[PDB]
Amino acid sequence: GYDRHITIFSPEGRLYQVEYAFKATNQTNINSLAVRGKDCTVVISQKKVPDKLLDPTTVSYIFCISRTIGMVVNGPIPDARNAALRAKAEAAEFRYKYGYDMPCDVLAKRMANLSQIYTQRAYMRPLGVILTFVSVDEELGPSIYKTDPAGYYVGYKATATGPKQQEITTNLENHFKKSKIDHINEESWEKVVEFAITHMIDALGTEFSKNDLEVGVATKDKFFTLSAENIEERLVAIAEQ
Amino acid sequence: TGYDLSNSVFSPDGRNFQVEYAVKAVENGTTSIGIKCNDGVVFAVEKLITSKLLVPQKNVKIQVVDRHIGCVYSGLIPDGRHLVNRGREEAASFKKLYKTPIPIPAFADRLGQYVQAHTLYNSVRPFGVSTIFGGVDKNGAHLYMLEPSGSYWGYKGAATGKGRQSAKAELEKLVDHHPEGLSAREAVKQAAKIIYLAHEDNKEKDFELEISWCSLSETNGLHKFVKGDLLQEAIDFAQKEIN
Amino acid sequence: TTIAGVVYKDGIVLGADTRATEGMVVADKNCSKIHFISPNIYCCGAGTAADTDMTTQLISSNLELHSLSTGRLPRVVTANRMLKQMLFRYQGYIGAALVLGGVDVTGPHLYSIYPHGSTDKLPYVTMGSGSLAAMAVFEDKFRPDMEEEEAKNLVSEAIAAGIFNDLGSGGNIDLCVISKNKLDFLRPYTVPNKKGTRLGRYRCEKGTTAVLTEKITPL
Amino acid sequence: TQQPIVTGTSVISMKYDNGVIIAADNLGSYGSLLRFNGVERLIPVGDNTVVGISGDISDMQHIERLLKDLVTENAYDNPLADAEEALEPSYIFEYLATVMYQRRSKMNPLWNAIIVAGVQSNGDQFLRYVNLLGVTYSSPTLATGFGAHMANPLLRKVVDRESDIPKTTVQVAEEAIVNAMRVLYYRDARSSRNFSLAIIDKNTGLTFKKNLQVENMKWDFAKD
Amino acid sequence: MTDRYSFSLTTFSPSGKLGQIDYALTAVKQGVTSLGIKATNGVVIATEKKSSSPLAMSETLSKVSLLTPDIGAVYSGMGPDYRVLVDKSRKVAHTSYKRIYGEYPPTKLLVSEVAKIMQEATQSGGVRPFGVSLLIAGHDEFNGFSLYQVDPSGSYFPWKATAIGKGSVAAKTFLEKRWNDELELEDAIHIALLTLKESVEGEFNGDTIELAIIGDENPDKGPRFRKLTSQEINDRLEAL
Amino acid sequence: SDPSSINGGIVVAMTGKDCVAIACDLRLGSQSLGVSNKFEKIFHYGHVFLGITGLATDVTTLNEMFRYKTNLYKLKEERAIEPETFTQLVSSSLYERRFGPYFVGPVVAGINSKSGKPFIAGFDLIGCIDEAKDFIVSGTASDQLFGMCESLYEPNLEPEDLFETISQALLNAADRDALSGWGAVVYIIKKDEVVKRYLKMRQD
Amino acid sequence: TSIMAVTFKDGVILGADSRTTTGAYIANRVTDKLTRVHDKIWCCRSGSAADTQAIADIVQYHLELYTSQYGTPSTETAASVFKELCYENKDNLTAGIIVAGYDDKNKGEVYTIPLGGSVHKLPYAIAGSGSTFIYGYCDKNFRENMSKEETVDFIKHSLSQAIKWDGSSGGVIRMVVLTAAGVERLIFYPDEYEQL
Amino acid sequence: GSRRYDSRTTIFSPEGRLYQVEYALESISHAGTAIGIMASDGIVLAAERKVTSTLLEQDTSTEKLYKLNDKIAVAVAGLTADAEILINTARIHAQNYLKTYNEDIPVEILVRRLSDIKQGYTQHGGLRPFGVSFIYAGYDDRYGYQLYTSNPSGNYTGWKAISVGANTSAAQTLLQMDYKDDMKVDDAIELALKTLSKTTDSSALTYDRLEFATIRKGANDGEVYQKIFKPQEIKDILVKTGIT
């Protein structure tokens, strides 16, 4: 049964190493969510600091890839950082060669094509991570694109990733079935973040403090992550209505 | 089964058993710790005196990287040395290009990516060391701890090796009882104590205490070894606390 | 060669003569010097002709593959970069002197690219042996935000200046008008010189040439 | 093969009874243009060595980094980095000498003349020269470029052979060096008034003197 | 890091089977149904857009890809493998052909180049075969309209009409009855939409179906490849 | 010293009405010394003809190289190469030696078998295409041929009118060049017959 | 070419002419020789246009990638990357680059990199063919901790003279102001500066 | 490391056979039968296509008979993709030889070259061999008409008549029974089709299940002509010989 140890076909036409890399994805036990506004793309993720000895400021699964592109990772941090460094490098090389900022989807496809190589070449293992890329693209507008260990990638209106992804997905599906639009019809990103947090609370059935969340926001010409106090202000507004 | 026979193979869990087996080598090693203080960091390590024939103060375990970073590790000592050699190459190339000495978070990822690379192929073995390291850069003090998987985080205090649970409990008390912070000279004393308390897990043989520190006020942000009177003052403080 | 370009209100007007020379001799009187890079970007070419042709073809090919992967129209800056970085790498040995003009998502852009890998971003440019003649016309009469038919005339007037005053330049005037709504490839835009009419027929009558042997093979 | 662009002129030096003195002006010439007036060309390595460098300033800055990097590297896994296993003048020199000759042998020289002045572990005076060709030599007085023609003659009147070194005090040697720097300022078209001087003594250690100036200048005979 | 896999991962078993090729074909079998039909004045290729989630924008995921202006491709099997074959096919159509001859390759030669790439994954060191079967439809001046199938082995066959993946056995029987040598392109599109409806479970409309044609030139030439819009498919579903 | 004028010789090609003509001299020399009067410079790959002037070792090499390439082309494509396609192949092949070129002056001539359109083309030594309808000239007496062709030529000539035009252009140009002549060949190419004629000319 | 960078109280200002010549022909009379390698790190370019453009693009790339990993680079770091390229490729380059940038910690900083590939940190720097004519003027008139208006006038007067005497220099005087407040672009036309 | 997963394609069994070559021959034994018959005035190549549907476009299809140059052709049995790799290599060797010597490559030289390539995959490199057996039909002015075969081992031999692929045992007996040295092309055409008609695993032999070719010097002015038969022509020759 060496067809389960390396990336070759089993008799069923399956790559077990790819499937087991998908299982490594949930090893962190963190749920992420991404939604789109009019002018923005918001990505929120659970933050869990179990050890009191940890510096909580260094515990992050959201990455600033370029100025326009942000990336949240569902999976172990070493593979997450492997993917982050490569994505940063690719985005910088792109801008040098082609003279304009790498689009979110072009990066997603590039990282996906790399992920595909590990599923075909035997010496390389897949990374045990799902990469959700976010930006406000200058051509396509608010963008969410996701990559996985299979080398699959696709654009999203909104998405969710993690152990309880199905609960979050159906919660989001139901809201967009009502509104009948591909986005959160809201001017300010502040309120799109408030939506994202609110719909995660409802879906997961857990309240959050400022230190239980981690928020990334893409606007035109910059992606940035929110501080604990910026999130606290967001949580106050949710509670007050 | 057979998923644990080769490095970089995912088990049906989603685990890399070879990395988890490297952790067993780390757990087998001597106790090492790190303490983040007000304007710097302190590193300390338990050195088991196997025999009377060992020359005191000569078999140094803590290693310096560049002039401002200290590294200490538990587990397979040669693997730790290999990782520091690489760290020195990384810190050197960084300074060569960018002029400034390598920042601690920047340096932490350099080691992190290299250790992670040794979990990507079956032709290499993972590192048999957890590495505690840090120093002072332009943004102040930073303490890190880096595992065989390539995982690392920032810490207030860190501990690894055979006496890690004992040490961790002691580090957690310091964090609770000093929210405003710990001074560099306090941290040297506390480091000594914690190694002495964590020695109950390696109590058969007697040991030798080794401490180092970077502090903005006490060492001008440079890594120095604690020697002579300051070392003896810390040993006396530790010996008093166990009794 | 006289090649030129201007930025006008709605977009870009490129211009070129049609004389290809070997030394002092004219090999082609109607040879095309305005090249296709992408559907929204064209390139006028001067200097060494082979280098001009192959450099544009390679960057056009690479931009086509880039544009298929990204699924969106290519930009002038990426055409500019790809030409620039290649020409620089070859340290002037690829003697391509280009006027690169096109219309992006970010609006109209015009560049001059030199053999050594320098580029200038400008509202008007001229290159080739007739650049000074053409540049005189632009310094005389250019203004920003021109209407289309005005810009067409100015470029045509600038290429003409080169045609008549520069010996390296001649033949017809080709234009290429690029805007968001259209691409007009005008070849020829003007025929400023009539072909010289011959007064005699000097063609020989059948059987005049002395043959030794003959062979016929069918296909 | 290159050509030197921004350049430093004479580095001068001599041995005396307890140590060595080295000096060099603070100018970075750009051909005839006296471009940079704040260039330090004496670069200390630890507390027992000063490397004085003339010639191409970019190549000097490269060598400056190699020495800075050498100190870092010697400290690695070396508990006696500030004691018995500290860098010696002879180690620092031999390294540079190896580098200089290796580079000339690849036809890509570091376009400099270097004098390594210092004091060894056992109190011995170290003073040795190396240049872009890898040519090395030692003498009681050493000087590079222009100073070889004007400073050496004056300094050799103080220490003419080995046996004069124990007879020469630090005051006599420093006066001689400062005197020689004045003579060079009158006569070297690519020198400057402002200079740095460094004494490495086996008792008093490294004394580094910045912002010195040539003074007592005889111009009064010009008016006639 | 040494890529130590310098030896074949596809080898002959005692029975004469190449296991990994057969297993790749099993992966293709599990994939969603796609088909191709050749008319007299065109070719049509079609597949189901099996959306992994309703939140996912299935417009971004193109199963039908343009290779050259006159050649199109569709697949059944592993999507990521298809994507990198399309990348290489597009590139080889420029490097080994267009930059040499100043024109795009004919359908059969581009097919042959893709087949070569897939064969090499079947014999080279340290790789598994591609887990896709391709259906390549195209036109060129001297061969006219053509439709090819390309399997994980690297083997390729020209077809009048065929189907691959999930319901290919049933779909091929359906096509055998309906196909003749006097079909117009519109007749072939009609048959494609009928044949594809059998293998589709859920929603059957322009948003869940991807369908392209190689036909007349759309205004040096115009491109013969054209991907049908979501509206254009729905119009033909009313006359179904 | 100048590689393009050691061995000498010329090629000219013309278009006519439903026909093309290509012609060349027969000389090969070492500068002043005449060596061969049987060195033909026109070759064919199917129905596409290729004249090549310049350094004779490169003439021979390129002939062998284009035979090689067009043979493989035919095996793969299952059809003979066309003039338009071959022209692009020549250009590519020449430019891939951009910084160490073949010292040659090639001339393509032929009729597109499908469209029936007469086609000619020329190239510099690094593959820039002269794409002229009227005529293409090459070799040591190119200037002489340009003059002859510009005054003698007119469009849409019948095959045997065109023969007299191209032949007189070649012969009279060659007689004003020291390094050309020693015989000549003229191909008259039609959609499905080719007439090859050797010309009588002065042998000095 | 006449270019200069001058530190002042609130930060630093870069200044440049706009003339690019091919021999005696002015190829571009509206050249932008002040190029941005980071938000508040810019450079003045002199020498081969192909070389200085190629370098500046590589630097921009390195500092973009530095920022992705380690946050905003110091002006010193930018100068070091410029130096590394210029020094290691000295045999194949003709580039004289002034690097200028604003940190909040360090405030305004100016580094000059002449032909050799050496680095020199200075209060102000002048460079290009036209600089020779204003060494005297600039030395006599420069003061430290000037106001923004004084530094704009110092650069304007200086480059005015550089332009007047150097044929290789001319056109408009462009400037780029780097302070805590942000990045301000200034332009000054012949009719303004010639009458000074 | 990687050693764990290595099949070791280039080793001897205890009996002194090459495992992978033997297994590749087993693969080839299931491929559609190909027959070569050499007459005094030409060579015949006949081959049976496999699986075939009514929807397979036959006139633009080539799985069995390929052209190497104007004098030499091959019939394939095994993996078609593997064959095409080797065929394009062979096509180049012929043109390299033509370029070097200005003469067409002799048939045996081309055959040896390909066979030497196949051999290399059995002795080094650690890769699987090519699962292909060729019948080479060719002419040159030294030996005249020649038939050869090669197989995955890299061994090649010359023949008067030969089969590869499926039912070669049965096919070779039927050929050995009816072949004679004075035979002519038209008779060999008939023998080839009769042999396939008896050895086929199909119910009947039809035009759509065949590829067919002849190498005749039988041309005007004694020059060699390769004829790859079109679908309609194979149908005519099937009626002529009396099989359909």
Ligand SMILES: *[C@@H](CS(C)(=O)=O)[C@H](Cc1ccc(CN)cc1)NC(=O)[C@H](C)NC(=O)[C@H](CC(C)C)NC(=O)[C@H](Cc1ccccc1)N=[N+]=[N-]
């Ligand atoms: C005008 C350029 S100029 C006089 O320098 O301003 C013109 C532009 C042009 C012509 C043709 C095309 C075709 N697509 C595109 C752009 N260029 C020339 O006239 C140019 C100088 N001529 C050629 O390059 C010429 C073309 C032949 C087909 C006649 N080839 C040559 O002159 C070669 C050049 C060469 C030889 C060796 C090494 C490098 C370059 N002549 N020769 N021999």
Ligand SMILES: [Cl-]
């Ligand atoms: Cl890619």
Ligand SMILES: [Mg+2]
């Ligand atoms: Mg793998």
Ligand SMILES: [Mg+2]
């Ligand atoms: Mg003559």
Ligand SMILES: [Mg+2]
């Ligand atoms: Mg003669």
Ligand SMILES: [Mg+2]
């Ligand atoms: Mg001026």
